[PDB]
Symmetry: C2
Subunit: 297 residues, 2 copies
């Protein structure tokens, strides 16, 4: 009875990178190969064109092409959530309709960045995007990038929308999130790998993860031990993958994910400017972290 | 290169007028542009933050640039906002603005995605290489979520097309030292710091409150220019009530609402920005009357 967010949206999702070819164009063959690899390693959902998928530097056309290719590769067996939010409500609406019509399983909608709308602007924005399609929708709260939080009262007001079902949380408000989950029934996903385990303690449904690019099997094991009550094993795994969160703070998710995947034998090309490929020295520093975390020989 | 002549000293980050249904209103853009220059602006920035660059299309940005160049380009400098978080997009938009006849470019730090400094360096170089227009960096970590660090600005200072900085970072003495070291022109990108920026050697203001108080800011620049800092301080305090309202509303909501209160209807913001509420408009009218820009 009731809408089961864990089953309908997933528990381990990667915010998948968008592969580009040598010339910079979208590489759907590799997007498909990567999607199969991440699901095979233990992800039960994927987010396409989130932040780590370089949503700022791809077109709507590329976003929809990518989504098509990923639904084709894994959509039968994993949930495919489409990133659709920007700082432009009219545009987010259009993009959310296009992803829905393409067959997406849910939407991930970021707080409008840069322009710093007031909370009632955010409420109006998220509501409008939620009214656009039948897709289950996740708010994406990340004041570190967007410059404004989704305030607790805004989240509460938004919980009454029939389509808004959860939050990807990168605000590290663990105490408030636990109370919001308790009061509203919203599903929280960790949107910061360094807080995967603390979020689980608070009631989080799962992870929308960057480091699952490299360590999806270990994060699967982590979720699986945590969910059974073997917190001790979950904590052990979390400690073991810490060098990846260290490399994350050095490089940021886009640089890290594309360079680590290449180190792991899955070349997904380089990022589009202003994002940058890791330098040779950063690649060597990255490799040492991946070895330490047991995701590279 | 004469930055003051070529880019101006008093500029407004002009709002983008919309008609009642929300579409671009170029005839109102033209009138507003004329009113602003009349009041004392010797330049205008189009499609800045205050011009709602986030919610307008490239198409609307070009139409707007054309309307304002046509309206005032003969007597004021027209600077085109061409920065986004996408280098290939910023390149095309810069070329588009150049091809229409923009006098200069304003290029914000890539927002949201937080590229590293070496990525910023690559981004600004590539944009500055796309056209022969003089370009200003627009450093606003409060919005973009990363600053342009001073070593990065010093590196970019050697690009022949990069002539200055719209500084919304509040690094006064560090900006003063860069100005002295490099010859880069600084403009205040914060009304709350307009006078301190002048004392640091800034060339002028790319202002929000100039929508409502250009004449007073023109007099502040003149009084500073003639070394009458007492008067400049007096004028600074006189207009500070507009900063009270800006803090409550933000620039976009404040500029559209305030203009409408002065008899220049420029329509509302586009979502996720919002029109001021009735009670907000009353509290704004109080602030405007306190700043003497409303009867």
């Amino acid at each position: 009875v009731g809408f089961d967010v864990a089953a309908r949206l997933g528990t381990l999702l990667t915010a998948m990178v968008t592969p580009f070819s040598g010339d910079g164009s979208l590489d759907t063959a590799t997007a498909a190969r990567l999607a199969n690899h991440l699901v095979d390693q233990g992800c039960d959902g994927l987010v396409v064109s989130g932040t780590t998928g370089e949503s700022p530097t791809t077109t709507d056309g590329e976003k929809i092409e990518l989504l098509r290719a990923v639904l084709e590769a894994v959509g039968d067996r994993a949930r495919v959530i489409a990133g659709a939010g920007t700082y432009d409500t009219a545009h987010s609406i259009r993009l959310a309709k296009a992803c829905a019509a393409e067959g997406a399983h849910g939407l991930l909608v970021v707080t409008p960045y840069y322009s710093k709308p007031p909370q009632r602007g955010l409420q109006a924005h998220f509501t409008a995007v939620a009214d656009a399609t039948e897709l289950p929708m996740l708010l994406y709260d990340i004041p570190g990038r967007s410059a404004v939080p989704i305030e607790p009262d805004t989240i509460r007001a938004l919980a009454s929308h029939p389509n808004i079902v959860g939050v990807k949380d990168a605000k590290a408000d663990l105490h408030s999130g636990a109370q919001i989950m308790a009061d509203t029934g919203l599903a929280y996903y960790s949107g910061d790998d360094a807080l995967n385990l603390p979020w689980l303690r608070m009631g989080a449904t799962g992870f929308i993860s960057v480091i699952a690019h490299l360590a999806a099997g270990q994060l699967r094991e982590l979720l699986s031990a945590f969910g059974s009550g073997d917190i001790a094993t979950a904590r052990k795994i979390n400690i073991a993958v810490a060098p990846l969160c260290n490399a994350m703070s050095r490089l940021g998710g886009v640089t890290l994910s594309k360079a680590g995947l290449r180190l792991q034998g899955i070349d997904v090309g380089d990022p589009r400017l202003p994002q940058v490929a890791a330098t040779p020295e950063q690649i060597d520093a990255l490799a040492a972290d991946m070895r330490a975390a047991s995701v590279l020989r």
